[PDB]
Amino acid sequence: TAKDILFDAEARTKLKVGVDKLANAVKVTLGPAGRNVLIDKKFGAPTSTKDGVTVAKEIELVDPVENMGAQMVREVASKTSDVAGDGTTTATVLAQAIYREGLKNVTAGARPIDLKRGIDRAVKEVVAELRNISRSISGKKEIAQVGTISANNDPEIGELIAEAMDKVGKDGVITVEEAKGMETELKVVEGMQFDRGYLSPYFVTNSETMEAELDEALILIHDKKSNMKELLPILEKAAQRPLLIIAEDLVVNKLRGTLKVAAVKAFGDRRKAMLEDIAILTGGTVEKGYKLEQAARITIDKDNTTIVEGKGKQEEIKARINEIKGQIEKSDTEKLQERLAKLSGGVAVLKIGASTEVEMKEKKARVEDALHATRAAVQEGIVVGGGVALIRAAKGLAKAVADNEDQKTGIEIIRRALEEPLRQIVANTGTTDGAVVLEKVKNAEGDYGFNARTEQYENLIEAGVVDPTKVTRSALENAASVASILLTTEAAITDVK
Amino acid sequence: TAKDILFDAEARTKLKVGVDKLANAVKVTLGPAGRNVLIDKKFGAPTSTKDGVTVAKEIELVDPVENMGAQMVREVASKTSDVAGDGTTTATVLAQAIYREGLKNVTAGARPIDLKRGIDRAVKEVVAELRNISRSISGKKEIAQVGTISANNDPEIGELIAEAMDKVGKDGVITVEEAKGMETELKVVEGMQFDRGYLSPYFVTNSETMEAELDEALILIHDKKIMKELLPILEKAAQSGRPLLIIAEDIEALATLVVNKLRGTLKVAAVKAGFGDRRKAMLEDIAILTGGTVISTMAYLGQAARITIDKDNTTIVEGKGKQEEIKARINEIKGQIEKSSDYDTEKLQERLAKLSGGVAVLKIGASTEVEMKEKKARVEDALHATRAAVQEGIVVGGGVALIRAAKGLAKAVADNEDQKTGIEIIRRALEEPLRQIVANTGTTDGAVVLEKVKNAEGDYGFNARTEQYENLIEAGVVDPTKVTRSALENAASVASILLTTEAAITDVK
Amino acid sequence: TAKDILFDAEARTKLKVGVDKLANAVKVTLGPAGRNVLIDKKFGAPTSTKDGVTVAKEIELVDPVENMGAQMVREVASKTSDAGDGTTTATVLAQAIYREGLKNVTAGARPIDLKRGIDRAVKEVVAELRNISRSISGKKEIAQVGTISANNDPEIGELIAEAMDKVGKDGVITVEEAKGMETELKVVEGMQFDRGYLSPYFVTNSETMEAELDEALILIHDKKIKELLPILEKAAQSGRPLLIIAEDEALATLVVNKLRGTKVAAVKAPGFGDRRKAMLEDIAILTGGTVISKGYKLENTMAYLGQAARITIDKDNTTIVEGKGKQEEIKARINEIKGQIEKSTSDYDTEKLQERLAKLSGGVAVLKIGASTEVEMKEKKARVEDALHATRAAVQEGIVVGGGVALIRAAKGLAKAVADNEDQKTGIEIIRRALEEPLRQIVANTGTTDGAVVLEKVKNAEGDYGFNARTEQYENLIEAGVVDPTKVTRSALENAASVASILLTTEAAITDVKE
Amino acid sequence: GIVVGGGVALIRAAKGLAKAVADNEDQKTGIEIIRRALEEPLRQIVANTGTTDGAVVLEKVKNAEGDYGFNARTEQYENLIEAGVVDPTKVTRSALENAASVASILLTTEAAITDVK
Ligand SMILES: [Ca+2]
Ligand SMILES: [Mg+2]
C-alpha cells in the first residue's frame, strides 16, 4: 500500500524517540532496587511487575516510526535472555546510551560508518577483557556454588544442578518438572533434543514461558511430509492423549476446539537417520511406508524440542546405539557420534517438591532460572555483578586502534556507555548522590563495587553478587549491533495512516 | 470513472516528485557502502535491508500522478535485473539524473523531442564504447573465475558453474537444487525446457524459490483449449500420489484448477503450449520424452521425476519415455534437416538440442540447513551473473565503466544546440552512479574522489568497501556488460518518455 | 532601521517581478503603433499618453524588492535618451536579457559566465552597428536629418542646419519661444558648463525637467553655503529671479520659497581646483558680475551680481544665454586666455584653455520659433527641440535603420564573439534573441497576431528592408524616412545589458522593514 | 610585513597547529575548529566565482606548498606573490584574532538580557 518515508536525521531522531520510550520504561526495574511498574488490564486490578522483561513485552507505540525503533531494540535485546537467560534490560539500557551519544555525534558531523567501526573495535576489546577478568567454573563444588547463588541462596538446589551436570555432563539435556511429592529428587531418564521447534506460536501451551508442553504424549514418526486434507483422518484416529507429529511439513483446532497436538520439523539423508533413532526411543514405527491418509513429557520450545522419558525396549534400544557405534569404525564421522550421544546420553529430570503448590511453583521458577544461569556459567565463566564488570572491562579500550578521529569517537561512545548500567543501578535506589557512587567504583579496581541491595560498598564476589560472563558480553554485543544498525539507517518506510 | 488531467509542465513536475521519492529511497542502498533501510510491518520488528530491489518493491505513493512516475521508472528499471540479474538501482539513479536535467532544460526553453533525440544518440555511442572496454568470457578457465566472483570468492562454486556450462553448453539448461548432503555434486539428466509459463501465480508450491515444484508428476497433453472431458480424466488421475501438469493452448479450467491447488484436493499445474503447426510438433517431443501421448486414459499421460515451473519458463526433468523411442524421434527431425528451406533450420535444430543435451542439476549443500539454502541461493545468483557475463562480456565495476564509456560521446552528432544539450545530459548522468556510491560512504569529500577517477583512465577506480583507490579488475570488482548497458538503456528510455509526456490522466479520489 | 534580506534565486526572482511590471507598462507604447496608457490624477479626468517616458516616470511599486528592480532598470534606461524613444527600447531589451539570463541560471549556468558572454556579445553588436551606420556631415545632410525629425519640414531642417553652421558642430544651441511671429536665428554671448541644479524642486517645467529663469541675476560664490539673507532678500524685492552659483541645511530653505513663489535656482560651481576659480571669473565677465571671494564678503552688493536674459538648467548642464556684460571686457578675457596658450609649457594646460576659450568666444546660438497662433507657437517650438536633439545626436555617431531593424542586422557581428565555454556561448545567444525583441514589440503594438511571420520576413531580408508600422507595409526604411541615430541604438543595448548583468550577479537584496 | 593573498596564507599557517598543546579531548576539539575554519575564507572566495566544483580547488591548494594558490579574478592556478595577490600580515592575523575572540565570548555566554518590546 501507500507509504510514508523519512530520511537522514529526521528518521533517526524519530526512531530515537521510540528507543527512549522503550528504555525509559524498562530501565527503572534494572537493579535489585528496581521500582514497580503498573500494567493495565481490561478489568480488575493492574499488574505490578519489577521484571524488565515483562515490561518490555508490553511496549507498543502508536506512531509507526517510533514503534519501529522500539521493536528494533526490543527484538535484539530479547536475544540476550534467549541464550544467556539474563541481560535483556541491561542490553536495552546500553542500546539507548550507545545510540544517543552516537546520534549526537552524527549531528556534529561525524561519519556514521566510522562510528560503527569504532564501536565494533571497542566492543571486541571490552568483550576480550571481560574474558580476562572472568573466573572459569569447572568441577562439581563450584558449579554447586554458582547454582546456589542463582537459587537465592538455596544449597539444596545448588547441589541438585551440580549433580545433574555430573551424570549427564555439562552439555547434557537437563529439564525441570514438577514433583509428585514434597521431596525434591533427581532422575536420569532416556530422551533426546533437537533444534527443530514448533511451526507456529499458537501451539504454545504456556503464555509467559513460550513453551508447548505435552504430558504423556504419543509420538507420530513418518519420514514422509502439511496442509493436505489427508491429515484430518490421521489426526483424530488415535486422539482420545496429546500427540506429537514429526514430519518435514491443526493450528486453530488446538487453540479453539479440544485437541492436544504438536507438529515440529524432522535435512536430506541426515533427516532420515534422525527419525529412525526416535523410533527406537519413543517406541514407535517410522517410501516403504504408509501415507498421510510415546513419551511421558514433550516440551516444544521455539528453537528446541526435547523428548523426556520416552518408552523403548531397554534391551532393543541398547542395540540401536551399538549399530551406530559399529558404523563409526568403518567411516564426516563427527555427525555419527552426535546421534550416538543423544540416544545414550539421556535426559536429566529435576523433580521439584515443596509444601504447597504456591510454594512448589515458586521454587520451580528459581530452579529453572538457576539452571539457565549455571549453564551459562560453565561455558564462558562468571564476572562481578552489579554492573561493575562492564566498568572494569573498559581497560581493554586502550588496545582498540582508531584509524581516524571519528573512529576514536566511537570508542569513547562505548567508554561512556559501559558506565550506564551501574548508573541506572544506583538511580533506582532513589538517591541523587549516585554520581559519587559511580566515582568510587570506577576509581577502585578488582571486585570492589557497590551493592544496591544493602546500599553498602563491599567485595561483590564474596557477597554473592555475580553475573555470568555470557550475560554481560551478550548484552553489550547485542546493544552495539542494534544501535549501530540505527546509526546507519538512512530511510524509514511505513504504511500510510 | 471521472478523471483529473494535468498538462505540460504541471504534469511533468508532479511526475518528477514521484521519480525523486523512488530514487532517493532506493539509491541509499547502492554500492558496497549502501546503508540500511527500515521497512515497517504489521506486528514485530521492522525489516532491515541494504538491497535496492527490496526497497523499490515497497514504494507506493498516495498522490496518483506522483505514484505514476514512480511506477514508470520502477517497472522500466525492473527489466534490468530480469535479463541481467543486477543493476536495478543503477538504472533508477540514472533515470533520476536524466529526467531532472532534461526537465531543467525544458523549462529553459529547449524542445523536448530534440532532447530525446540527443539522449538516444549519446546512449547509442556510450553502449558502443562500453563494448570496447568489455572483456569477453569464454572457456572453463575464465568462466570459473567469473563464477567465483559472484560466489563471494568461493572457488568451489566457480568450478561447478564452469563444468555445468561445459556439459550442456553456454545456452544449455542448468538447474540448482538442494543437495542431500554437505558435499556438492553435479549430474546431467534427461529433460527439456519450454518458453511458456504458468497461467496463475497460485500454482507455486514453494513461495521462497517462487517456482512450482511437482515431484514425480503426471503430464496431460491436449491440442484444443480446455470441464467436459477434463473431470473424467482428471478424476481418474485425481487418485495418484503424483501431481498433474496441464499442457494445452490455454486453461472453464481457470477457476477450478486454482481452487483445487489452494485446497488439499490435488496438486495441479497448468502451462500453455510457440504457435501454428510448430506447436503441435513440440507436443510430440514432450510426449515421447515423457512416454505419454498427445490428445487430438492414464496410459496417455507422461511421467517425469520432477517439474519446476518458472515465471516465463517450464522445466521437465528425467522423462520416463523409452530411450529407443526418443532416438527414433531425434533422427526423425535430424534427417528432416537434410530434407530441407531457409525457413526452418535452427527451429528444428533447437528441438534436437532439447532431446539430446538434457538438463544439468547443480546440487549445493553445507553443514547446516541455514547455510545450505543460503549458499544454494548464492549459487543461483552466481549462476545468473555468470551466464549474463558470458553473453556480453565483463566491464569494470564501481560505476567506472560508465565514466570510461564517456569517450564515445565525441562520436555523437548533434544537429542543433538542443540535441547537443541532450548529449551533455548523458555526460553528466554517467557520473551519478559513482557519485552516489561514494556518497553512501558518508564522506563530504566525495567531489574529490570523483575527480581522481575521471582524471585517471582504464582500470583505475575507487573501491568503496576498502575506501582505497586501486585496480578494480584485480580486486574482484566487476559488473557484466549486459548489466551496465541495460541500466543505461532502460533509464534513458523511461526518462525520454517522461520528457515527452504532455498529459497525465488519473482517476478522481 | 531593521532590514529584511533576500538571497540568490529568491531575491533575483522578486527583482524580476519589478522589472517586468516596468517593462510591460512602458513597452505597449513602443513604436509608431504604440497604444494608450491612462494615468490617474488626484482630481478630474486622467492623463492619456502614448509616450513611454511619461509612463516610466509614474512606475512605482509597493513591494520594496520589486520596486528596486523596477527603479534599477528605470534609471539605467534613462541614461540612454539622456530622447528618441531609446529609453523604452533599453527597457524592453533589459527585460529580455534578464528573463533569459535567469532562465539559464536555474538551468545551471554560472551567472558570471553569462555576464562575460553577454558583454563580449554587446561589444561585437555595437562594433557591427558602427559599420552599418551612415555618418552625417555638412549643412546639406544635416538639413535632411533635421527635416526628418521635424516630420517633413524643410524650414526646421534648414534652421537647424544653419544653426550648426554658425556655432559649429560642438557649439551650444538653444531654443526659445519667440516674442514675434517670424522665426529667426540669433547668436549671442553666453556659455554652458557641466553643473546642473542641486534639487529637482528648482525646475519650473515638469515636462522638460528644465529650470528656466527669464531675466535673472547670477550670484557667484567661491565657498559652500544663513548669512546670504542680505543679498538673497535684495533679489526678492528686486523682482528678478536669482541664480546662485556656489561650491555647494540652507539648500532646503530655498526649496520652500521656490514652491511658494518667493524664483531661486542653485547650481554647483563648475570644475574644481584652480580651474574652478578660473571659470567663475569667466562667468562674472560674461554676465557682468563679480565673484564673491579673496577680499570679498558674502554678506556685503547688487552691482556684484551678474545679469542674463535666460538661464536654462537641467539635471546636467547650465546654459547662460545673453550675457549682459560689456562686449569689450569679454573679448579682453579672450586675449588674456589666448596669451597663455603660447606661454604654456605643458600639454594639459594648452588643451584645457581651449575649452575655456571656446565658451566665451563661441557664444550661444538661440533659435527663436515663430508661428501664426500662440497655441501653434508652443507646439512648433517643441517640434524644433526634439528635432535639434535628434539631429545633434545623428551627427556624432551617425545614423542607422529605424523600426528595430538595425539591431537585427547588427546580430551578424555575433559570429565574431569568442566564448570560452558553453555558459559564455549562452550569454552570446541571449543577446541574439534579445536583438529581435524591440521589433517584435513594435509589430505587437499594431494588434496583429501574425507578427511571428513579420519578424522572419525582416530577418531573412537584407540591408534596410523592413516593416513600417505606420502604413503596415514592407519597404526600405531609409527611403521611407524611418531612421534612428546610431548613438541611440547602441546606448539602448549597452545600458540594457549593463543593468541586466548587475541583476544576474546580485546575490542579496537588503530593504527596510515595515514602518 | 606581507603574506600570501587569496586566503592561502591562513591555510599555509595551519602547520603551526602541530605545536598546539591540548590538555584533554575538548581542547583538542577546539584546535580542530580552527583547522577547518582556516579553509573557510578561501572556500568562500572560490564559491563567489559561481563554480559548481569548490572542493577540487581547495584540495589542490591545500596539497601544494609555498605561495602557490588559486587566483579568483582570472580563474587560474598561479603563484600569488608573483601575480600580485598579496595581503598585509596585520590584516590576516587581526581577522583571525578578532573572529576567535568574539566567537569565544558567544560560546561562553550563558544568558542574553534584552528589553521588552
Ligand atoms: Ca479499562
Ligand atoms: Mg509610442
CATH class category name of the largest domain in chain A: Mainly Alpha
Radius of gyration of chain A: 25 Å
What is the CATH architecture assignment of the largest domain in chain A?
Orthogonal Bundle
Number of strands of chain A: 17
CATH superfamily of the largest domain in chain A: GroEL-like equatorial domain
Structural class call of chain A reads alpha+beta
Oligomer state equals part of a larger assembly
Keywords (chain C): ATP-binding, Chaperone, Cytoplasm, Isomerase, Nucleotide-binding
EC number (chain C): 5.6.1.7
Main location (chain C): cytoplasm
Subcellular location (chain C): Cytoplasm
Would you kindly provide a brief summary of this structure?
This is part of a larger assembly, with four copies of chain A. The first copy, chain A, is α+β, with helices and mostly antiparallel strands. In chain A, 49% of the residues lie in helices and 17% in strands.
Q: Which descriptors would you attach to this protein?
A:
unfolded protein binding (chain C), GROEL, domain 2, part of a larger assembly, GROEL, domain 1, 3-stranded mixed beta sheet, binds calcium ion, alpha+beta, binds magnesium ion, 6-stranded mixed beta sheet, 49% helix, 17 strands, 19 helices, 4 chains, 497 residues
Lay out the secondary structure.
The structure is cut from a larger assembly and holds four copies of chain A.
Chain A (H helix, E strand, L loop, with lengths): L2 E5 H19 L10 E3 L7 E3 L2 H6 L6 H20 L4 H20 L4 H21 L7 H10 L5 H13 L5 E6 L6 E5 L1 E4 L17 E10 L9 H5 L7 E4 L4 H5 L5 E4 L4 H14 L12 E6 L4 E6 L3 H16 L4 H12 L1 E6 L4 H24 L1 E3 L3 H5 L12 H13 L2 H8 L6 H10 L4 E4 L4 E4 H4 L2 E3 H19 L1 E7 L2
Parallel strand pairs in A: 4-12, 7-8, 8-9
Antiparallel strand pairs in A: 1-17, 2-3, 5-12, 6-11, 7-10, 10-11, 13-16, 14-15
Helix pairs in contact in A: 1-3, 1-4, 3-4, 3-19, 4-15, 4-19, 5-15, 5-19, 6-7, 6-13, 11-12, 16-17
The complex binds calcium ion (CA) and magnesium ion.
Magnesium ion binds next to loops of chain C.
